[PDB]
Design an enzyme around this catalytic site. Structure first.
Site, mmCIF file in Angstrom:
data_model
loop_
_atom_site.group_PDB
_atom_site.id
_atom_site.type_symbol
_atom_site.label_atom_id
_atom_site.label_comp_id
_atom_site.label_asym_id
_atom_site.label_seq_id
_atom_site.Cartn_x
_atom_site.Cartn_y
_atom_site.Cartn_z
ATOM 1 C CD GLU D 63 -3.184 0.568 2.170
ATOM 2 O OE1 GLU D 63 -2.932 -0.308 3.023
ATOM 3 O OE2 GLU D 63 -4.176 1.323 2.239
ATOM 4 N N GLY D 136 -2.667 -9.207 5.259
ATOM 5 C CA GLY D 136 -2.076 -9.795 4.066
ATOM 6 C C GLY D 136 -0.677 -9.281 3.791
ATOM 7 C CB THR D 137 0.774 -5.867 3.741
ATOM 8 O OG1 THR D 137 -0.009 -5.440 4.864
ATOM 9 C CG2 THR D 137 0.157 -5.337 2.462
ATOM 10 C CB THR D 171 -9.261 -4.049 13.520
ATOM 11 O OG1 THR D 171 -9.756 -3.038 12.633
ATOM 12 C CG2 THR D 171 -7.997 -4.650 12.939
ATOM 13 C CD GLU D 246 25.860 -12.938 25.282
ATOM 14 O OE1 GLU D 246 25.146 -12.319 26.092
ATOM 15 O OE2 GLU D 246 27.106 -12.865 25.279
HETATM 16 N N1 LIG Z 1 0.165 -2.587 17.656
HETATM 17 C C1 LIG Z 1 -0.205 -2.029 16.508
HETATM 18 N N2 LIG Z 1 -0.890 -2.775 15.571
HETATM 19 C C2 LIG Z 1 -1.274 -2.214 14.400
HETATM 20 C C3 LIG Z 1 -0.975 -0.888 14.135
HETATM 21 N N3 LIG Z 1 -1.463 -0.590 12.916
HETATM 22 C C4 LIG Z 1 -2.056 -1.688 12.403
HETATM 23 N N4 LIG Z 1 -1.957 -2.701 13.315
HETATM 24 C C5 LIG Z 1 -2.456 -4.072 13.132
HETATM 25 O O1 LIG Z 1 -2.084 -4.496 11.835
HETATM 26 C C6 LIG Z 1 -3.114 -5.246 11.230
HETATM 27 C C7 LIG Z 1 -3.146 -5.019 9.721
HETATM 28 O O2 LIG Z 1 -1.883 -4.578 9.275
HETATM 29 P P1 LIG Z 1 -1.507 -4.571 7.709
HETATM 30 O O3 LIG Z 1 -1.549 -5.961 7.133
HETATM 31 O O4 LIG Z 1 -0.135 -3.976 7.543
HETATM 32 O O5 LIG Z 1 -2.574 -3.616 6.982
HETATM 33 P P2 LIG Z 1 -2.268 -3.052 5.503
HETATM 34 O O6 LIG Z 1 -1.046 -2.170 5.457
HETATM 35 O O7 LIG Z 1 -3.479 -2.332 4.968
HETATM 36 O O8 LIG Z 1 -2.008 -4.387 4.651
HETATM 37 P P3 LIG Z 1 -3.176 -5.471 4.469
HETATM 38 O O9 LIG Z 1 -4.250 -5.215 5.495
HETATM 39 O O10 LIG Z 1 -2.594 -6.843 4.669
HETATM 40 O O11 LIG Z 1 -3.761 -5.373 3.083
HETATM 41 C C8 LIG Z 1 -4.399 -4.814 11.908
HETATM 42 O O12 LIG Z 1 -5.170 -5.947 12.221
HETATM 43 C C9 LIG Z 1 -3.972 -4.125 13.186
HETATM 44 O O13 LIG Z 1 -4.392 -4.884 14.292
HETATM 45 C C10 LIG Z 1 -0.288 -0.135 15.071
HETATM 46 O O14 LIG Z 1 -0.023 1.041 14.839
HETATM 47 N N5 LIG Z 1 0.097 -0.708 16.261
HETATM 48 N N1 LIG Z 2 33.826 -11.356 39.742
HETATM 49 C C1 LIG Z 2 33.367 -11.004 38.518
HETATM 50 N N2 LIG Z 2 32.506 -11.837 37.885
HETATM 51 C C2 LIG Z 2 32.018 -11.531 36.663
HETATM 52 C C3 LIG Z 2 32.438 -10.276 36.031
HETATM 53 N N3 LIG Z 2 31.817 -10.216 34.841
HETATM 54 C C4 LIG Z 2 31.067 -11.338 34.720
HETATM 55 N N4 LIG Z 2 31.182 -12.115 35.808
HETATM 56 C C5 LIG Z 2 30.506 -13.415 36.006
HETATM 57 O O1 LIG Z 2 31.136 -14.408 35.198
HETATM 58 C C6 LIG Z 2 30.150 -15.261 34.618
HETATM 59 C C7 LIG Z 2 30.609 -15.716 33.242
HETATM 60 O O2 LIG Z 2 30.630 -14.617 32.336
HETATM 61 P P1 LIG Z 2 31.740 -14.607 31.173
HETATM 62 O O3 LIG Z 2 32.408 -15.955 31.064
HETATM 63 O O4 LIG Z 2 32.760 -13.526 31.422
HETATM 64 O O5 LIG Z 2 30.922 -14.286 29.833
HETATM 65 P P2 LIG Z 2 31.692 -14.461 28.436
HETATM 66 O O6 LIG Z 2 32.997 -13.711 28.514
HETATM 67 O O7 LIG Z 2 30.846 -13.923 27.308
HETATM 68 O O8 LIG Z 2 31.977 -15.923 28.196
HETATM 69 C C8 LIG Z 2 28.869 -14.455 34.555
HETATM 70 O O9 LIG Z 2 27.772 -15.268 34.973
HETATM 71 C C9 LIG Z 2 29.070 -13.310 35.525
HETATM 72 O O10 LIG Z 2 28.182 -13.452 36.635
HETATM 73 C C10 LIG Z 2 33.378 -9.421 36.785
HETATM 74 O O11 LIG Z 2 33.780 -8.338 36.311
HETATM 75 N N5 LIG Z 2 33.784 -9.842 37.986
#
Ligand SMILES: Nc1nc2c(ncn2[C@@H]2O[C@H](COP(=O)(O)OP(=O)(O)OP(=O)(O)O)[C@@H](O)[C@H]2O)c(=O)[nH]1
Ligand SMILES: Nc1nc2c(ncn2[C@@H]2O[C@H](COP(=O)(O)OP(=O)(O)O)[C@@H](O)[C@H]2O)c(=O)[nH]1
Ligand SMILES: Nc1nc2c(ncn2[C@@H]2O[C@H](COP(=O)(O)OP(=O)(O)O)[C@@H](O)[C@H]2O)c(=O)[nH]1
Lengths: 48, 41, 12, 430, 50, 51, 114, 22, 431, 431
Positions: D63, D136-137, D171, D246
């Site tokens: 659209e 649909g979109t 809706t 992660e």
């Molecule tokens: N949370 C949230 N939901 C939205 C919002 N605007 C639309 N929706 C939801 O999106 C649904 C439809 O989205 P779309 O498919 O993108 O509508 P469209 O752009 O006219 O495309 P088509 O309807 O598929 O032809 C509706 O059922 C709404 O519930 C918004 O601003 N916030």
């Molecule tokens: N004592 C200490 N513990 C830490 C610190 N940072 C992280 N940890 C702990 O170490 C654990 C393992 O994290 P880590 O191995 O460093 O993450 P990775 O490096 O992405 O593998 C985590 O669950 C933390 O609770 C720090 O600066 N000091």
């Protein structure tokens, strides 16, 4: 949760299962504190 | 042929572990179908 | 150099 | 270096993208003209020699009106004109129309521009696909694009932030139909699918932000805040850094099970702000509250499998550890027996930026809790009967058949959704 | 000469920018806040930091 | 057919075993050909004028 | 360095020519060659002659060290190197810095750089 | 839900029957 | 003149290494620019154990900084002592292991391990004599655990006789950070048992305990835990760097600590850790240091020694102290707590004394205890690993990296065998 | 008093030679106008090796510039040192060789070779004693490769006893510039094997790898590659120009490097190449120089030595250094890497020491390795040449220049035989 959702009481005491928390009565200059020594789920022998 | 025998023993242990895992999975499926029957009834 | 290092054979 | 390619498909996708890119421009200081008066923008923006920053985004729609709104609005000098891709005929809420007949050329051009974007990225954490399951979109064209991406790019992590139909309020009429079709399509392509419900976000705005007349702009602002919190670890440094890769490793227990509930906290207006402490434990509890979840799905019915917490702002690892210990000790929250840890905490030192003119207040701490939990099977159960109620009479089936579908496609999609239900039961039960 | 020296100047300026960023982060203390002690005083020696 | 020699082969001889064929040609070089391999294993040089 | 409750070059009457050619002297070149030859043990003699472990030695002590290394070195050359190592000091230049500077300015060929 | 599952199974059986007839 | 090659692995390992190098540079009087500014001869006397001299007076760590993601060592370079390190020793990839030991050991670690080994070999060959390597890293992380175990295996292959010391941050008992911590820890412990000669086990929750109960801190960040780990890492090797009344190198500590080769896991603690309020009030004496070190709360390991039995225990004291006083205190500790000490070893204590206390402290003492208490830690990690492995949760992420399921079972079997040996030597009776 | 005639061929050869002359003039304190501004006796002591004195104080290179198109040497005169060369030594055609070896060797190279040889003879006769000629050019180009090989053949005919040194830029393995590079390289290798006494192999991709990994440059132009090549070409002959503690001329290097006449292709490298950021982070020592010198990344040849075996290796060090230290370093390298060195030669290292380091660098070392690893480069060139020759693509361009098809196969046979000899001495066993 009923005992209290306190982060300190829940976690810090529980660490190493020490189950004791140190609450100071003021600054470090006062330097005196309280060890709660609270084991959750067990009656102290005094009140057992 | 000691290394070959050790490798064969390791392969036998691997097959045993895989069979045990399959049996455990079957037990889990049996448990969940039992629980589903219990809740639906 | 597949077999260029044999012992001397058939002195004749 | 940590570039992430953003795709916004359909009306909902483009409208949430407006809020998302406004949020990113505000967060990184980029003016709407394109340039700002380090290198944290590289995740979402690629800078040119002139100093102007252009987003690595692609606005796809069949659209023209929605895209022309962006072409005319404030962010007309920011986006790439060819990156804004517009169709000629709308999909008319037909998954067949958006997936078999109209969507072919549009998705081919979409792959062309996505390739141009990916060629400009040193690293590539993945794709952020924002579409609307139920249109649909969104459904058809998004599914086709995801299929092509899985075919060509391969192992790149695709995160689908899908908006699913609400339980009772809706809706559209064929929304269960194309929702089932899109769900069958994306069960096997997207790596992590984040579920969102308009009813849930409306309830959030009503009770927390105290908006008695919520609108799509507010919904999209909240969703943009959620996505910003999710990606904050890529752009801003902090303790316990978490990565896009992660997410799946700490969050997806099995390849089939990758649908996830999202909950942001705190959601407080400017008026009632600074009236409570808003400590780490309190905001964690608010995030785990069943009401705060952005899907109409009670977590009490199911069991949490994994919970990834993204903390923003003045948050310390001991605070998050104590909060998660309290959450584990809470008896309302129930986890699966096979995941004793079930928790992935990641902190960041950047507090959430507040959009001027928005309803959110400036909070120094924030939590985005994204959870894989078996309770999500409830919403699939709802769509599974909302679909079958019409499919029994084959209502609106001829509309889909006219654009190159068969009754077999509906049968296969519905069977796949039932298999997904069975898998959710199997993982949830011991 | 201008071509070669402009290329070299661009490379050197990029290196200097990276070095300046690292030095500024080091001096202002914002860098490596992940590994910065919560309390100002030295924990082991119970001494106030400079 | 061996074609490494680019000039006239003045002389060709077999080894007494017969696995090697020595070809001395106008190219100043003496090439030893391995019959099972079909390749010139050694290319003796050092003759200023034709062999 | 203890509290004390003028330049080394000014002391001993070192001439500007000596200051300029301190490292260019053939005897100083030989001293630098010996210091480079004794890698990481170059400061061993200075350490042995430094009783206080203060890292600093007087003119007499470092002249003794330099004579123990190379007999031909006179005290004026050593003092000139002391001055070029530490410009403003009341004697007691660090022997580690002395050795490091001399080895750094060491020259392979006496004809070059002298 | 169980009804429509069994209906899709019935449809697959009918398609199999038609293929067998062919 | 007995050099040590330091290696940092993963986010936690890199940050711990940065804090450790900050501590060592402070102890040796090295400013962040590398120039010596310490004004003490003993500081420079054995500076070569950790540092090498540059063209100028600059002194640079013999450290090798490993990672698969660049942001962590960008922060390391931005840290207060970020520019001391040789820039060539920063080996990092492009995409990090998603907390995946398989990714850090097999797929992504394979390419970067060649460059890592090149840097390690270049640092080792420059050493006059090599005491060994010390690898600081965290079990329960992808790049950390994976690359650390792989590099430890490679270094064991290349230099079998050289000492290997590990500082492994074992995942915490109660509050876990990431989900796959049991998997990574189980796969890493199996490698450490076979390869690592000497291993220190550290726990974030144990450090949090010591910082609330001894140090009485309020909101201690990871910097404080890294600071305490750095204190232990310095104190274990201060005998190499400073003259000692009864000195003891790493090999001496390992020989006196390890009764049997597989029982090389040790818990460590540092003294004196005291709060600010009672600093004027606490008595700085050898008996006070011994009383603190033998406390279970002083341990940086989560397992409490009361449940287990002390197979061996080394205490490295620092400060001008009476050797008789030290020996009498530790003999008295043995006699008082004979129930906690193994019977078939007449003396379970290795006393080392160094003459230089750490800066600011009148005295210090580091403790390294080989006790069967760590059995319960390994048991808990096995309890989590088995719980996940029964249902094969998250197993597909590792399986997609090209490691067999059989490796998990083998690692669990080896870890359980280690637990069984610890129990056997806990309940072994003399004669 | 042992003169060297420098010859530049082709665009690449001319640019490399211009950079080399700039570097040599910088080393000898020669400004682009020819006047000496070095203020050092040693710079003028042996200036006659490369330069000749004009009527005034001007010093002119003994360089001869060869090309078939005038644009490249117009750039040569526009270069920074374009004015030192005599205008009479610029020998140019009018139609450049279209990357055609046949054009540069038979059709268009025939006419200009008269002037080339006339100038070469004029420069050679004026020399008191002639060490030999050094020709810098690039294999894989028309005028450079073809015309240069023609000149080399003519000079070998005229002066059989005089040394012949070649610096050939062999086409790179991965990224090739021109399509006919395999053809031109195959034809030029056949000439270099028969004629060139000593040949150095250089690769633009190897130069890019070294300047991106070691120097850590981001945008290295051709000027930087020419700079590295110029450093090597200066360092090879610094022993003639400067006093040495253990000097070694070109003929000595060739005698100690070449076991057999056809195995005279060498791969070269220069140390210390240090990144700008780590210049303060590298300690300039003889062991560090050797560590970088024996590294495969420092080699400017694409082939890595690890695949093959070092037949011989010469190392010319420059700077204030210990002969004991250098000799022990090379002996220790041989002992450590005995696998990579040929067994039937008791000592595979020719070490030379010069007392004059390059300006700014306290120490330096150039490496010239004769190893069987170059076998794989010639093998790759054969793999390309055969692929193109089977379908005879682009063969008509060489055929239309009056070149017989048999010449291509003769060149291929010669290069394959060279590969065979390299393999034979790679796998030759003692006794
Ligand atoms: N949370 C949230 N939901 C939205 C919002 N605007 C639309 N929706 C939801 O999106 C649904 C439809 O989205 P779309 O498919 O993108 O509508 P469209 O752009 O006219 O495309 P088509 O309807 O598929 O032809 C509706 O059922 C709404 O519930 C918004 O601003 N916030
Ligand atoms: N004592 C200490 N513990 C830490 C610190 N940072 C992280 N940890 C702990 O170490 C654990 C393992 O994290 P880590 O191995 O460093 O993450 P990775 O490096 O992405 O593998 C985590 O669950 C933390 O609770 C720090 O600066 N000091
Ligand atoms: N190192 C270096 N190589 C170059 C330079 N100019 C060209 N080359 C390379 O030399 C190769 C052959 O080109 P060249 O011999 O100069 O062409 P010709 O002059 O017509 O023979 C090309 O593949 C280029 O990549 C330069 O300035 N430096």
């Amino acid at each position: 949760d009923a005992r209290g959702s306190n982060p300190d009481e829940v976690w810090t005491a529980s660490l190493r299962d020490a189950w004791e928390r140190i609450l100071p009565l003021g600054s470090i200059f006062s330097g005196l504190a309280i060890k709660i020594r609270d084991r959750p789920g067990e009656l102290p022998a005094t009140r057992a | 042929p000691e290394l070959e025998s050790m490798r064969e023993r390791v392969r036998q242990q691997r097959a045993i572990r895989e069979a045990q895992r399959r049996r455990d999975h079957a037990a889990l499926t049996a448990s969940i179908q039992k629980r589903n029957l219990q809740e639906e009834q | 150099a597949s077999l260029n290092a044999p012992p001397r054979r058939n002195p004749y | 270096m940590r570039e992430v390619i953003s795709i916004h498909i359909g009306q909902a996708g483009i409208q949430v993208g407006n809020a998302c890119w406004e949020l990113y421009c505000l967060e990184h200081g980029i003016q709407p003209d394109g340039q700002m008066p380090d290198d944290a923008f590289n995740t979402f923006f690629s800078e040119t020699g002139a100093g102007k920053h252009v987003p690595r985004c692609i606005f796809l729609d069949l659209e023209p009106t929605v895209v022309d709104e962006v072409r005319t609005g404030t962010y007309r000098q920011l986006f790439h004109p060819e990156q804004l891709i517009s169709g000629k005929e709308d999909a008319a809420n037909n998954f067949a129309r958006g997936h078999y007949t109209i969507g072919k050329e549009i998705v081919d051009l979409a792959l062309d521009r996505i390739r141009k974007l990916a060629d400009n990225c040193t690293g590539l954490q993945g794709f952020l696909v924002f579409n609307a399951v139920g249109g649909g979109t969104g459904s058809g064209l998004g599914s086709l694009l995801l299929e092509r991406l899985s075919v060509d790019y391969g192992k790149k992590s695709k995160l689908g932030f899908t908006v699913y139909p609400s339980p009772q309020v809706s809706t559209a009429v064929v929304e269960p139909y194309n929702s089932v079709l899109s769900t069958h399509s994306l069960l096997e392509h997207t790596d992590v699918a984040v579920m969102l419900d308009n009813e849930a976000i409306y309830d959030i705005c009503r009770r927390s932000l105290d908006i008695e007349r919520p609108t799509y702009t507010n919904l999209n602002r909240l969703i943009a805040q959620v996505i910003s919190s999710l990606t904050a670890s890529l752009r801003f440094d902090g303790a316990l850094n978490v990565d896009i890769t992660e997410f799946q490793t700490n969050l997806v227990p099995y390849p089939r099970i990758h649908f996830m509930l999202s909950s942001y906290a705190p959601i407080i207006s400017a008026e009632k702000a600074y009236h409570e402490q808003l400590s780490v434990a309190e905001i964690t509890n608010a995030a785990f509250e069943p009401a705060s979840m952005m899907v109409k799905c009670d977590p009490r019915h199911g069991k949490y499998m994994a919970c990834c917490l993204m903390y923003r702002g003045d948050v310390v690892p001991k605070d998050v550890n104590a909060s998660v210990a309290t959450i584990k000790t809470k008896r309302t929250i129930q986890f699966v027996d096979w995941c004793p840890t079930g928790f992935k905490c990641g902190i960041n030192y950047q507090p959430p930026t507040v959009v001027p003119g928005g309803d959110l207040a400036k909070v120094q701490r924030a939590v985005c809790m994204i959870s894989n939990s078996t309770a999500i099977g409830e919403i699939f159960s709802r769509l599974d009967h909302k679909f079958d109620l019409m499919y029994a009479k084959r209502a609106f089936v001829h509309w889909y058949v006219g654009e190159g579908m068969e009754e077999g496609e509906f049968s296969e999609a519905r069977e796949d959704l039932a298999a997904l239900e069975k898998d959710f039961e199997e993982v949830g039960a011991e | 000469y201008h071509r070669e020296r402009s290329n070299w100047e661009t490379q050197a300026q990029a290196a200097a920018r990276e070095a300046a960023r690292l030095e500024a982060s080091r001096t202002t203390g914002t860098g490596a806040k992940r590994n910065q002690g919560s309390e100002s005083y030295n924990i082991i020696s119970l001494n106030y930091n400079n | 057919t061996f074609t490494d020699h680019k000039q006239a082969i003045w002389s060709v001889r077999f080894h007494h075993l017969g696995e090697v064929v020595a070809s001395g040609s106008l190219d100043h070089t003496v090439r030893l050909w391995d019959l099972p391999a079909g390749k010139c294993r050694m290319a003796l040089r050092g003759h200023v004028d034709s062999v | 360095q203890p509290q004390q409750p003028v330049p080394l070059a000014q002391s001993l009457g070192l001439t500007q020519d000596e200051v300029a050619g301190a490292l260019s002297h053939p005897m100083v070149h030989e001293l630098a060659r010996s210091l480079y030859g004794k890698a990481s043990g170059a400061t061993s003699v200075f350490v042995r002659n430094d009783l206080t472990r203060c890292g600093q030695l007087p003119v007499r002590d470092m002249t003794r060290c330099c004579q123990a290394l190379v007999p031909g070195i006179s005290e004026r050359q050593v003092a000139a190197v002391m001055a070029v190592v530490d410009p403003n000091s009341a004697g007691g230049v660090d022997y580690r810095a002395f050795v490091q500077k001399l080895t750094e300015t060491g020259v392979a060929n006496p004809r070059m750089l002298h | 839900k169980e009804k429509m599952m069994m209906s899709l199974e019935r449809d697959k059986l009918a398609a199999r029957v038609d293929a067998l007839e062919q | 003149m007995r050099e040590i090659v330091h290696i940092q692995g993963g986010q936690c390992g890199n940050q711990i290494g940065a804090k450790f190098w900050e501590v060592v540079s402070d102890e040796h009087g090295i400013d962040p620019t590398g120039t010596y500014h310490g004004d003490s001869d003993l500081q420079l006397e054995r500076i070569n154990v950790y540092f090498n001299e540059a063209t100028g007076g600059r002194y640079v760590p013999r450290a090798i900084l490993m990672d698969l993601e660049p942001g962590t060592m960008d922060s390391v370079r931005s840290g207060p002592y970020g520019q001391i390190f040789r820039p060539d020793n920063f080996v990092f990839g492009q995409t990090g292991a998603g907390n995946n030991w398989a990714k850090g050991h097999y797929t992504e670690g394979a390419e970067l391990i060649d460059s890592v080994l090149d840097v390690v070999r270049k640092e080792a060959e420059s050493c006059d004599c090599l005491q060994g390597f010390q690898v600081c890293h965290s079990l329960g992380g992808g790049t950390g655990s994976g690359m650390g175990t792989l590099l430890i295996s490679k270094i064991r292959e290349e230099y079998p006789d050289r000492m290997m010391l590990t500082f492994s941050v074992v995942p915490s008992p109660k509050v876990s950070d990431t989900v796959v911590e049991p998997y990574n820890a189980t796969l890493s412990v199996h490698q450490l048992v076979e390869n690592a000669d000497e291993c220190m086990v550290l726990d974030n929750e144990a450090l949090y305990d010591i910082c609330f109960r001894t140090l009485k801190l309020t909101t201690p960040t990871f910097g404080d835990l890294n600071h305490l780990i750095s204190a232990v890492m310095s104190g274990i090797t201060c005998c190499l760097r400073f003259p000692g009344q009864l000195n003891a190198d790493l090999r001496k500590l390992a020989v006196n600590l390890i009764p049997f080769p597989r029982l090389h896991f040790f818990m460590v603690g540092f003294t004196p850790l005291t709060s600010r309020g009672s600093q004027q009030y606490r008595a700085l004496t050898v008996p006070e240091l011994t009383q603190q070190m033998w406390d279970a709360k002083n341990m940086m390991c989560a397992a409490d020694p009361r449940h287990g039995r002390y197979l061996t225990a080394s205490a490295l004291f620092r400060g001008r102290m009476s050797t008789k006083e030290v020996d009498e205190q530790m003999l008295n500790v043995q006699n008082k707590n004979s129930s906690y000490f193994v019977e078939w070893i007449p003396n379970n204590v290795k006393s080392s004394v160094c003459d230089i206390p750490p800066k600011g402290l009148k005295m210090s003492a580091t403790f390294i205890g080989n006790s069967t208490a760590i059995q319960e830690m390994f048991k808990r990690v096995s309890e989590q690993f088995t719980a996940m492995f029964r249902r094969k949760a998250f197993l597909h992420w590792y399986t997609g990296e090209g490691m067999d399921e059989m490796e998990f079972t083998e690692a669990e079997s080896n870890m359980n065998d280690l637990v069984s040996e610890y129990q056997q030597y806990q309940d072994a009776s003399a004669e």
